[PDB]
Amino acid sequence: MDCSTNISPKQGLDKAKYFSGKWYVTHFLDKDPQVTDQYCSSFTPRESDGTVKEALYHYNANKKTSFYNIGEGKLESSGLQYTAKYKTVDKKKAVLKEADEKNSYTLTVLEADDSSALVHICVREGSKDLGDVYTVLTHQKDAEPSAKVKSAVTQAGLQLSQFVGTKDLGCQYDDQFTSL
Ligand code: HEM
């Protein structure tokens, strides 16, 4: 299901609060009703001199499988957003497949504070949208998102009741992979 185009970079968020530690997705919203599988995800985003690089993990809770990626792209000047190319790696961060240059994802930060964040991610494989997901993030696994981030969900036009909560899914994480 095609990504929403009504996402725009925000000015005025604090990037130091976003590019810090690791994030766990506590709640996710894929409006596509054709999907069945639910995921857990964690990632650790960094920024140096305008380049964003991040280590990413997905766990398919239905299939009990996982995959790992490293993304890299430029920090937008217009707001807290970046469009990254991604390679596939193993749990030891060895490269399994270099990036497919036709593929990218755009991550747009909607809110970020010391405990929590809200982001939107659209993954594109050339002219096909793999899909988009809104993710509520916290630094601690299974934590409660802040009031400020919960407000951002509403103010994005969304309802938190519609998100899937990951704390009940039986997630397996790889915390060594996302560690500092
Ligand atoms: C719980 C949250 C998330 C859900 C439900 C989700 C869902 C998915 C699904 C269904 C796929 C396709 C898997 C496959 O069939 O190969 C996927 C791939 C991908 N996701 Fe997510 N995702 C989540 C979080 C994230 C985050 C936080 C990022 C970026 C920081 C992200 C980036 C990507 C990328 C780049 C791919 C392509 C990977 C590859 O083909 O190697 N996703 N995700």
Side-chain angles (χ1 to χ4, degrees), residues 25 28 30 38-41 43 54 56 58 67 69 82 86-88 105 107 119 121 123 125 130 133 135 137 166:
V25 175
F28 69 88
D30 184 1
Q38 300 183 141
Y39 288 72
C40 315
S41 179
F43 71 106
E54 60 195 10
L56 168 71
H58 289 65
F67 63 92
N69 295 94
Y82 43 96
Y86 54 97
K87 57 193 74 187
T88 68
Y105 63 96
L107 188 155
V119 312
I121 311 106
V123 179
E125 296 182 325
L130 189 211
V133 176
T135 59
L137 307 182
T166 64

PDB file of all heavy atoms in Angstrom, residues 25 28 30 38-41 43 54 56 58 67 69 82 86-88 105 107 119 121 123 125 130 133 135 137 166, ligand 1:
ATOM      1  N   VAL A  25      10.660   0.229  18.923  1.00  0.00           N
ATOM      2  CA  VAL A  25       9.302   0.601  18.525  1.00  0.00           C
ATOM      3  C   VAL A  25       8.320   0.030  19.524  1.00  0.00           C
ATOM      4  O   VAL A  25       8.187  -1.207  19.637  1.00  0.00           O
ATOM      5  CB  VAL A  25       8.990   0.085  17.121  1.00  0.00           C
ATOM      6  CG1 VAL A  25       7.594   0.345  16.749  1.00  0.00           C
ATOM      7  CG2 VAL A  25       9.936   0.697  16.115  1.00  0.00           C
ATOM      8  N   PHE A  28       3.261   0.614  16.526  1.00  0.00           N
ATOM      9  CA  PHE A  28       3.419   0.905  15.126  1.00  0.00           C
ATOM     10  C   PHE A  28       2.075   0.908  14.415  1.00  0.00           C
ATOM     11  O   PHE A  28       1.137   0.203  14.768  1.00  0.00           O
ATOM     12  CB  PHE A  28       4.407  -0.070  14.416  1.00  0.00           C
ATOM     13  CG  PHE A  28       3.897  -1.491  14.281  1.00  0.00           C
ATOM     14  CD1 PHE A  28       3.140  -1.862  13.172  1.00  0.00           C
ATOM     15  CD2 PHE A  28       4.225  -2.470  15.213  1.00  0.00           C
ATOM     16  CE1 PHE A  28       2.687  -3.172  13.008  1.00  0.00           C
ATOM     17  CE2 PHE A  28       3.738  -3.746  15.063  1.00  0.00           C
ATOM     18  CZ  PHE A  28       3.012  -4.103  13.943  1.00  0.00           C
ATOM     19  N   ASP A  30       0.761   0.557  10.601  1.00  0.00           N
ATOM     20  CA  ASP A  30       0.682   0.284   9.155  1.00  0.00           C
ATOM     21  C   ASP A  30      -0.757   0.170   8.838  1.00  0.00           C
ATOM     22  O   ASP A  30      -1.403  -0.792   9.237  1.00  0.00           O
ATOM     23  CB  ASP A  30       1.444  -0.951   8.747  1.00  0.00           C
ATOM     24  CG  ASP A  30       1.429  -1.148   7.264  1.00  0.00           C
ATOM     25  OD1 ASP A  30       0.816  -0.293   6.542  1.00  0.00           O
ATOM     26  OD2 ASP A  30       2.027  -2.139   6.776  1.00  0.00           O
ATOM     27  N   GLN A  38       3.164  -9.154  12.228  1.00  0.00           N
ATOM     28  CA  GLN A  38       3.523  -8.075  13.108  1.00  0.00           C
ATOM     29  C   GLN A  38       4.985  -8.157  13.423  1.00  0.00           C
ATOM     30  O   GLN A  38       5.548  -9.222  13.506  1.00  0.00           O
ATOM     31  CB  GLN A  38       2.685  -8.141  14.336  1.00  0.00           C
ATOM     32  CG  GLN A  38       1.232  -8.011  13.888  1.00  0.00           C
ATOM     33  CD  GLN A  38       0.302  -7.995  15.014  1.00  0.00           C
ATOM     34  OE1 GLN A  38      -0.693  -7.233  15.005  1.00  0.00           O
ATOM     35  NE2 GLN A  38       0.529  -8.892  15.971  1.00  0.00           N
ATOM     36  N   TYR A  39       5.614  -6.982  13.582  1.00  0.00           N
ATOM     37  CA  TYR A  39       7.036  -6.892  13.827  1.00  0.00           C
ATOM     38  C   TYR A  39       7.373  -6.161  15.099  1.00  0.00           C
ATOM     39  O   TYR A  39       6.619  -5.337  15.587  1.00  0.00           O
ATOM     40  CB  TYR A  39       7.709  -6.128  12.696  1.00  0.00           C
ATOM     41  CG  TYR A  39       7.797  -6.845  11.412  1.00  0.00           C
ATOM     42  CD1 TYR A  39       6.699  -7.062  10.610  1.00  0.00           C
ATOM     43  CD2 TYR A  39       9.020  -7.406  11.017  1.00  0.00           C
ATOM     44  CE1 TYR A  39       6.846  -7.806   9.408  1.00  0.00           C
ATOM     45  CE2 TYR A  39       9.156  -8.102   9.870  1.00  0.00           C
ATOM     46  CZ  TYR A  39       8.083  -8.318   9.062  1.00  0.00           C
ATOM     47  OH  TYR A  39       8.239  -9.014   7.888  1.00  0.00           O
ATOM     48  N   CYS A  40       8.526  -6.522  15.622  1.00  0.00           N
ATOM     49  CA  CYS A  40       9.236  -5.694  16.551  1.00  0.00           C
ATOM     50  C   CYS A  40      10.422  -5.095  15.820  1.00  0.00           C
ATOM     51  O   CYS A  40      10.927  -5.692  14.870  1.00  0.00           O
ATOM     52  CB  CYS A  40       9.692  -6.534  17.738  1.00  0.00           C
ATOM     53  SG  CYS A  40       8.351  -7.611  18.289  1.00  0.00           S
ATOM     54  N   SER A  41      10.886  -3.931  16.258  1.00  0.00           N
ATOM     55  CA  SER A  41      12.053  -3.290  15.621  1.00  0.00           C
ATOM     56  C   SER A  41      12.794  -2.452  16.634  1.00  0.00           C
ATOM     57  O   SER A  41      12.223  -1.879  17.539  1.00  0.00           O
ATOM     58  CB  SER A  41      11.576  -2.458  14.439  1.00  0.00           C
ATOM     59  OG  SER A  41      12.695  -1.813  13.814  1.00  0.00           O
ATOM     60  N   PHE A  43      16.545   0.181  16.561  1.00  0.00           N
ATOM     61  CA  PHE A  43      17.593   0.743  15.746  1.00  0.00           C
ATOM     62  C   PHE A  43      18.348   1.821  16.508  1.00  0.00           C
ATOM     63  O   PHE A  43      17.897   2.337  17.526  1.00  0.00           O
ATOM     64  CB  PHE A  43      17.057   1.263  14.404  1.00  0.00           C
ATOM     65  CG  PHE A  43      16.211   2.536  14.503  1.00  0.00           C
ATOM     66  CD1 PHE A  43      16.757   3.748  14.087  1.00  0.00           C
ATOM     67  CD2 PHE A  43      14.914   2.494  14.913  1.00  0.00           C
ATOM     68  CE1 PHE A  43      15.993   4.941  14.121  1.00  0.00           C
ATOM     69  CE2 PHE A  43      14.139   3.683  14.931  1.00  0.00           C
ATOM     70  CZ  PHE A  43      14.705   4.862  14.531  1.00  0.00           C
ATOM     71  N   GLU A  54      22.741   4.384  10.516  1.00  0.00           N
ATOM     72  CA  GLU A  54      21.993   3.730  11.559  1.00  0.00           C
ATOM     73  C   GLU A  54      22.036   2.217  11.361  1.00  0.00           C
ATOM     74  O   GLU A  54      22.026   1.736  10.236  1.00  0.00           O
ATOM     75  CB  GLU A  54      20.538   4.283  11.669  1.00  0.00           C
ATOM     76  CG  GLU A  54      19.690   4.140  10.459  1.00  0.00           C
ATOM     77  CD  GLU A  54      18.442   5.019  10.527  1.00  0.00           C
ATOM     78  OE1 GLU A  54      18.378   5.855  11.444  1.00  0.00           O
ATOM     79  OE2 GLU A  54      17.586   4.872   9.662  1.00  0.00           O
ATOM     80  N   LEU A  56      19.880  -1.133  12.085  1.00  0.00           N
ATOM     81  CA  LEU A  56      18.470  -1.456  12.169  1.00  0.00           C
ATOM     82  C   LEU A  56      18.220  -2.964  12.253  1.00  0.00           C
ATOM     83  O   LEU A  56      18.916  -3.735  11.627  1.00  0.00           O
ATOM     84  CB  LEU A  56      17.823  -0.845  10.926  1.00  0.00           C
ATOM     85  CG  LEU A  56      16.433  -1.209  10.558  1.00  0.00           C
ATOM     86  CD1 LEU A  56      15.472  -0.594  11.559  1.00  0.00           C
ATOM     87  CD2 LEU A  56      16.150  -0.676   9.195  1.00  0.00           C
ATOM     88  N   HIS A  58      14.839  -5.846  12.512  1.00  0.00           N
ATOM     89  CA  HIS A  58      13.438  -6.234  12.479  1.00  0.00           C
ATOM     90  C   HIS A  58      13.323  -7.677  12.955  1.00  0.00           C
ATOM     91  O   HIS A  58      14.131  -8.547  12.565  1.00  0.00           O
ATOM     92  CB  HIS A  58      12.868  -6.270  11.084  1.00  0.00           C
ATOM     93  CG  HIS A  58      12.651  -4.929  10.359  1.00  0.00           C
ATOM     94  ND1 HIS A  58      13.639  -4.084   9.984  1.00  0.00           N
ATOM     95  CD2 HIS A  58      11.484  -4.377   9.945  1.00  0.00           C
ATOM     96  CE1 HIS A  58      13.116  -3.094   9.326  1.00  0.00           C
ATOM     97  NE2 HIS A  58      11.804  -3.236   9.255  1.00  0.00           N
ATOM     98  N   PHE A  67      15.933  -9.865  10.531  1.00  0.00           N
ATOM     99  CA  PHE A  67      16.883  -9.356   9.588  1.00  0.00           C
ATOM    100  C   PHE A  67      17.457  -8.016  10.046  1.00  0.00           C
ATOM    101  O   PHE A  67      16.832  -7.281  10.818  1.00  0.00           O
ATOM    102  CB  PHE A  67      16.326  -9.263   8.163  1.00  0.00           C
ATOM    103  CG  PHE A  67      15.155  -8.318   7.983  1.00  0.00           C
ATOM    104  CD1 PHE A  67      15.339  -6.980   7.612  1.00  0.00           C
ATOM    105  CD2 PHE A  67      13.898  -8.793   8.103  1.00  0.00           C
ATOM    106  CE1 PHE A  67      14.233  -6.147   7.422  1.00  0.00           C
ATOM    107  CE2 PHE A  67      12.813  -7.972   7.951  1.00  0.00           C
ATOM    108  CZ  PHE A  67      12.992  -6.565   7.592  1.00  0.00           C
ATOM    109  N   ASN A  69      19.949  -4.464   9.027  1.00  0.00           N
ATOM    110  CA  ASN A  69      20.333  -3.570   7.990  1.00  0.00           C
ATOM    111  C   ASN A  69      21.235  -2.463   8.556  1.00  0.00           C
ATOM    112  O   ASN A  69      21.206  -2.152   9.749  1.00  0.00           O
ATOM    113  CB  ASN A  69      19.140  -2.868   7.335  1.00  0.00           C
ATOM    114  CG  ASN A  69      18.206  -3.821   6.605  1.00  0.00           C
ATOM    115  OD1 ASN A  69      17.216  -4.292   7.166  1.00  0.00           O
ATOM    116  ND2 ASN A  69      18.509  -4.130   5.375  1.00  0.00           N
ATOM    117  N   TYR A  82      15.720  12.196   6.734  1.00  0.00           N
ATOM    118  CA  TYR A  82      16.791  11.711   5.889  1.00  0.00           C
ATOM    119  C   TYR A  82      16.273  10.569   5.012  1.00  0.00           C
ATOM    120  O   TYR A  82      15.390   9.789   5.400  1.00  0.00           O
ATOM    121  CB  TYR A  82      17.987  11.190   6.702  1.00  0.00           C
ATOM    122  CG  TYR A  82      17.661  10.326   7.905  1.00  0.00           C
ATOM    123  CD1 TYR A  82      17.669   8.933   7.834  1.00  0.00           C
ATOM    124  CD2 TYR A  82      17.374  10.895   9.124  1.00  0.00           C
ATOM    125  CE1 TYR A  82      17.453   8.134   8.955  1.00  0.00           C
ATOM    126  CE2 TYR A  82      17.148  10.127  10.229  1.00  0.00           C
ATOM    127  CZ  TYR A  82      17.193   8.744  10.148  1.00  0.00           C
ATOM    128  OH  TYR A  82      16.964   7.988  11.287  1.00  0.00           O
ATOM    129  N   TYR A  86      20.299   1.358   2.007  1.00  0.00           N
ATOM    130  CA  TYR A  86      20.447   0.330   3.037  1.00  0.00           C
ATOM    131  C   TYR A  86      21.095  -0.932   2.499  1.00  0.00           C
ATOM    132  O   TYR A  86      20.727  -1.450   1.466  1.00  0.00           O
ATOM    133  CB  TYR A  86      19.121   0.048   3.708  1.00  0.00           C
ATOM    134  CG  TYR A  86      17.994  -0.316   2.786  1.00  0.00           C
ATOM    135  CD1 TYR A  86      17.637  -1.609   2.546  1.00  0.00           C
ATOM    136  CD2 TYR A  86      17.231   0.661   2.185  1.00  0.00           C
ATOM    137  CE1 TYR A  86      16.567  -1.933   1.732  1.00  0.00           C
ATOM    138  CE2 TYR A  86      16.178   0.394   1.387  1.00  0.00           C
ATOM    139  CZ  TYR A  86      15.848  -0.939   1.130  1.00  0.00           C
ATOM    140  OH  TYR A  86      14.768  -1.217   0.320  1.00  0.00           O
ATOM    141  N   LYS A  87      22.047  -1.402   3.249  1.00  0.00           N
ATOM    142  CA  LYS A  87      22.629  -2.712   3.001  1.00  0.00           C
ATOM    143  C   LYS A  87      22.087  -3.707   4.012  1.00  0.00           C
ATOM    144  O   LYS A  87      21.468  -3.293   5.009  1.00  0.00           O
ATOM    145  CB  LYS A  87      24.092  -2.676   3.033  1.00  0.00           C
ATOM    146  CG  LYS A  87      24.671  -2.190   4.211  1.00  0.00           C
ATOM    147  CD  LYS A  87      26.183  -1.888   4.046  1.00  0.00           C
ATOM    148  CE  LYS A  87      26.460  -0.684   3.268  1.00  0.00           C
ATOM    149  NZ  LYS A  87      27.919  -0.555   3.002  1.00  0.00           N
ATOM    150  N   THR A  88      22.209  -4.977   3.693  1.00  0.00           N
ATOM    151  CA  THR A  88      21.822  -6.052   4.582  1.00  0.00           C
ATOM    152  C   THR A  88      23.064  -6.583   5.218  1.00  0.00           C
ATOM    153  O   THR A  88      24.075  -6.780   4.560  1.00  0.00           O
ATOM    154  CB  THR A  88      21.102  -7.140   3.877  1.00  0.00           C
ATOM    155  OG1 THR A  88      21.933  -7.844   2.997  1.00  0.00           O
ATOM    156  CG2 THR A  88      20.100  -6.566   3.007  1.00  0.00           C
ATOM    157  N   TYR A 105      14.866   4.515   1.882  1.00  0.00           N
ATOM    158  CA  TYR A 105      13.763   4.854   2.786  1.00  0.00           C
ATOM    159  C   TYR A 105      13.914   6.247   3.259  1.00  0.00           C
ATOM    160  O   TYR A 105      15.006   6.732   3.476  1.00  0.00           O
ATOM    161  CB  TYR A 105      13.658   3.876   3.983  1.00  0.00           C
ATOM    162  CG  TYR A 105      14.839   3.832   4.925  1.00  0.00           C
ATOM    163  CD1 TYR A 105      14.866   4.574   6.096  1.00  0.00           C
ATOM    164  CD2 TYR A 105      15.903   3.036   4.694  1.00  0.00           C
ATOM    165  CE1 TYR A 105      15.898   4.489   6.970  1.00  0.00           C
ATOM    166  CE2 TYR A 105      16.929   2.897   5.565  1.00  0.00           C
ATOM    167  CZ  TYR A 105      16.957   3.629   6.709  1.00  0.00           C
ATOM    168  OH  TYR A 105      18.020   3.552   7.563  1.00  0.00           O
ATOM    169  N   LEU A 107      12.951   8.547   6.383  1.00  0.00           N
ATOM    170  CA  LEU A 107      12.537   8.616   7.783  1.00  0.00           C
ATOM    171  C   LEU A 107      12.370  10.085   8.134  1.00  0.00           C
ATOM    172  O   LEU A 107      13.266  10.910   7.946  1.00  0.00           O
ATOM    173  CB  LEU A 107      13.551   7.911   8.627  1.00  0.00           C
ATOM    174  CG  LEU A 107      13.152   7.727  10.090  1.00  0.00           C
ATOM    175  CD1 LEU A 107      13.862   6.548  10.686  1.00  0.00           C
ATOM    176  CD2 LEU A 107      13.495   8.974  10.922  1.00  0.00           C
ATOM    177  N   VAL A 119       8.258   8.745  14.600  1.00  0.00           N
ATOM    178  CA  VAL A 119       8.780   8.865  13.268  1.00  0.00           C
ATOM    179  C   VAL A 119       7.862   8.169  12.272  1.00  0.00           C
ATOM    180  O   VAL A 119       7.051   7.329  12.628  1.00  0.00           O
ATOM    181  CB  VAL A 119      10.226   8.360  13.120  1.00  0.00           C
ATOM    182  CG1 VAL A 119      11.122   8.906  14.190  1.00  0.00           C
ATOM    183  CG2 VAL A 119      10.345   6.861  13.111  1.00  0.00           C
ATOM    184  N   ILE A 121       8.263   6.230   8.467  1.00  0.00           N
ATOM    185  CA  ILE A 121       9.217   5.634   7.556  1.00  0.00           C
ATOM    186  C   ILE A 121       8.487   5.160   6.315  1.00  0.00           C
ATOM    187  O   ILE A 121       7.489   4.453   6.420  1.00  0.00           O
ATOM    188  CB  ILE A 121       9.916   4.420   8.170  1.00  0.00           C
ATOM    189  CG1 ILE A 121      10.450   4.689   9.560  1.00  0.00           C
ATOM    190  CG2 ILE A 121      11.034   3.904   7.246  1.00  0.00           C
ATOM    191  CD1 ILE A 121       9.683   4.058  10.651  1.00  0.00           C
ATOM    192  N   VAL A 123       9.479   3.067   2.863  1.00  0.00           N
ATOM    193  CA  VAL A 123      10.475   2.312   2.145  1.00  0.00           C
ATOM    194  C   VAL A 123      10.046   2.188   0.681  1.00  0.00           C
ATOM    195  O   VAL A 123       8.942   1.724   0.421  1.00  0.00           O
ATOM    196  CB  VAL A 123      10.725   0.930   2.790  1.00  0.00           C
ATOM    197  CG1 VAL A 123      11.751   0.163   1.983  1.00  0.00           C
ATOM    198  CG2 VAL A 123      11.156   1.021   4.239  1.00  0.00           C
ATOM    199  N   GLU A 125      11.213   0.625  -3.137  1.00  0.00           N
ATOM    200  CA  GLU A 125      12.077  -0.228  -3.966  1.00  0.00           C
ATOM    201  C   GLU A 125      11.882   0.220  -5.397  1.00  0.00           C
ATOM    202  O   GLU A 125      10.939  -0.181  -6.063  1.00  0.00           O
ATOM    203  CB  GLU A 125      11.649  -1.647  -3.775  1.00  0.00           C
ATOM    204  CG  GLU A 125      11.829  -2.167  -2.352  1.00  0.00           C
ATOM    205  CD  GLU A 125      11.437  -3.631  -2.198  1.00  0.00           C
ATOM    206  OE1 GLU A 125      10.486  -4.049  -2.865  1.00  0.00           O
ATOM    207  OE2 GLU A 125      12.141  -4.377  -1.449  1.00  0.00           O
ATOM    208  N   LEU A 130       7.309  -0.222  -0.871  1.00  0.00           N
ATOM    209  CA  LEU A 130       7.150  -1.341   0.008  1.00  0.00           C
ATOM    210  C   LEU A 130       6.066  -1.039   1.016  1.00  0.00           C
ATOM    211  O   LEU A 130       5.201  -1.885   1.276  1.00  0.00           O
ATOM    212  CB  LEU A 130       8.449  -1.658   0.653  1.00  0.00           C
ATOM    213  CG  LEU A 130       8.634  -2.921   1.479  1.00  0.00           C
ATOM    214  CD1 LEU A 130       9.638  -2.718   2.599  1.00  0.00           C
ATOM    215  CD2 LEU A 130       7.372  -3.683   1.912  1.00  0.00           C
ATOM    216  N   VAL A 133       5.126   3.050   7.639  1.00  0.00           N
ATOM    217  CA  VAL A 133       4.784   2.743   9.015  1.00  0.00           C
ATOM    218  C   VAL A 133       5.086   3.983   9.839  1.00  0.00           C
ATOM    219  O   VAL A 133       6.132   4.590   9.677  1.00  0.00           O
ATOM    220  CB  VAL A 133       5.646   1.502   9.566  1.00  0.00           C
ATOM    221  CG1 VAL A 133       5.382   1.219  11.032  1.00  0.00           C
ATOM    222  CG2 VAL A 133       5.482   0.220   8.683  1.00  0.00           C
ATOM    223  N   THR A 135       5.980   4.898  13.688  1.00  0.00           N
ATOM    224  CA  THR A 135       6.476   4.184  14.850  1.00  0.00           C
ATOM    225  C   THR A 135       6.686   5.128  16.028  1.00  0.00           C
ATOM    226  O   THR A 135       7.379   6.132  15.917  1.00  0.00           O
ATOM    227  CB  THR A 135       7.796   3.482  14.560  1.00  0.00           C
ATOM    228  OG1 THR A 135       8.779   4.449  14.149  1.00  0.00           O
ATOM    229  CG2 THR A 135       7.682   2.461  13.450  1.00  0.00           C
ATOM    230  N   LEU A 137       8.559   5.385  19.439  1.00  0.00           N
ATOM    231  CA  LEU A 137       9.816   4.894  19.884  1.00  0.00           C
ATOM    232  C   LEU A 137      10.079   5.304  21.311  1.00  0.00           C
ATOM    233  O   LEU A 137       9.720   6.385  21.767  1.00  0.00           O
ATOM    234  CB  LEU A 137      10.940   5.586  19.052  1.00  0.00           C
ATOM    235  CG  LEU A 137      10.782   5.488  17.551  1.00  0.00           C
ATOM    236  CD1 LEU A 137      11.958   6.153  16.881  1.00  0.00           C
ATOM    237  CD2 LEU A 137      10.727   4.016  17.102  1.00  0.00           C
ATOM    238  N   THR A 166       3.850  -3.400  20.703  1.00  0.00           N
ATOM    239  CA  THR A 166       4.810  -4.471  20.587  1.00  0.00           C
ATOM    240  C   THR A 166       5.090  -5.172  21.908  1.00  0.00           C
ATOM    241  O   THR A 166       5.636  -6.247  21.878  1.00  0.00           O
ATOM    242  CB  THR A 166       6.077  -3.998  19.949  1.00  0.00           C
ATOM    243  OG1 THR A 166       6.630  -3.016  20.873  1.00  0.00           O
ATOM    244  CG2 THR A 166       5.859  -3.328  18.637  1.00  0.00           C
TER     245      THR A 166
HETATM  246  C1  HEM B   1       7.494  -2.276  14.111  1.00  0.00           C
HETATM  247  C2  HEM B   1       7.951  -1.435  13.181  1.00  0.00           C
HETATM  248  C3  HEM B   1       8.147  -1.855  11.751  1.00  0.00           C
HETATM  249  C4  HEM B   1       7.352  -2.610  10.979  1.00  0.00           C
HETATM  250  C5  HEM B   1       5.975  -3.155  11.242  1.00  0.00           C
HETATM  251  C6  HEM B   1       8.052  -2.792   9.720  1.00  0.00           C
HETATM  252  C7  HEM B   1       7.641  -3.555   8.699  1.00  0.00           C
HETATM  253  C8  HEM B   1       8.447  -3.948   7.641  1.00  0.00           C
HETATM  254  C9  HEM B   1       8.140  -4.980   6.668  1.00  0.00           C
HETATM  255  C10 HEM B   1       6.827  -5.746   6.609  1.00  0.00           C
HETATM  256  C11 HEM B   1       9.168  -5.061   5.814  1.00  0.00           C
HETATM  257  C12 HEM B   1       9.337  -6.060   4.638  1.00  0.00           C
HETATM  258  C13 HEM B   1      10.023  -7.378   5.139  1.00  0.00           C
HETATM  259  C14 HEM B   1      10.327  -8.313   3.980  1.00  0.00           C
HETATM  260  O1  HEM B   1       9.369  -8.883   3.482  1.00  0.00           O
HETATM  261  O2  HEM B   1      11.490  -8.442   3.524  1.00  0.00           O
HETATM  262  C15 HEM B   1      10.131  -4.098   6.247  1.00  0.00           C
HETATM  263  C16 HEM B   1      11.326  -3.828   5.582  1.00  0.00           C
HETATM  264  C17 HEM B   1      12.096  -2.708   5.832  1.00  0.00           C
HETATM  265  N1  HEM B   1      11.929  -1.835   6.848  1.00  0.00           N
HETATM  266 FE1  HEM B   1      10.586  -1.941   8.301  1.00  0.00          FE
HETATM  267  N2  HEM B   1       9.239  -2.080   9.738  1.00  0.00           N
HETATM  268  C18 HEM B   1       9.314  -1.496  10.980  1.00  0.00           C
HETATM  269  C19 HEM B   1      10.293  -0.643  11.358  1.00  0.00           C
HETATM  270  C20 HEM B   1      11.249  -0.070  10.551  1.00  0.00           C
HETATM  271  C21 HEM B   1      12.125   1.040  10.901  1.00  0.00           C
HETATM  272  C22 HEM B   1      12.128   1.737  12.236  1.00  0.00           C
HETATM  273  C23 HEM B   1      12.876   1.278   9.806  1.00  0.00           C
HETATM  274  C24 HEM B   1      13.927   2.356   9.579  1.00  0.00           C
HETATM  275  C25 HEM B   1      14.618   2.961  10.529  1.00  0.00           C
HETATM  276  C26 HEM B   1      12.481   0.339   8.807  1.00  0.00           C
HETATM  277  C27 HEM B   1      13.084   0.166   7.571  1.00  0.00           C
HETATM  278  C28 HEM B   1      12.901  -0.860   6.708  1.00  0.00           C
HETATM  279  C29 HEM B   1      13.728  -1.150   5.597  1.00  0.00           C
HETATM  280  C30 HEM B   1      14.874  -0.321   5.108  1.00  0.00           C
HETATM  281  C31 HEM B   1      13.193  -2.313   5.022  1.00  0.00           C
HETATM  282  C32 HEM B   1      13.804  -3.083   3.861  1.00  0.00           C
HETATM  283  C33 HEM B   1      14.814  -4.116   4.319  1.00  0.00           C
HETATM  284  C34 HEM B   1      15.424  -4.990   3.259  1.00  0.00           C
HETATM  285  O3  HEM B   1      14.761  -5.257   2.263  1.00  0.00           O
HETATM  286  O4  HEM B   1      16.602  -5.366   3.433  1.00  0.00           O
HETATM  287  N3  HEM B   1      11.464  -0.448   9.261  1.00  0.00           N
HETATM  288  N4  HEM B   1       9.709  -3.444   7.368  1.00  0.00           N
END
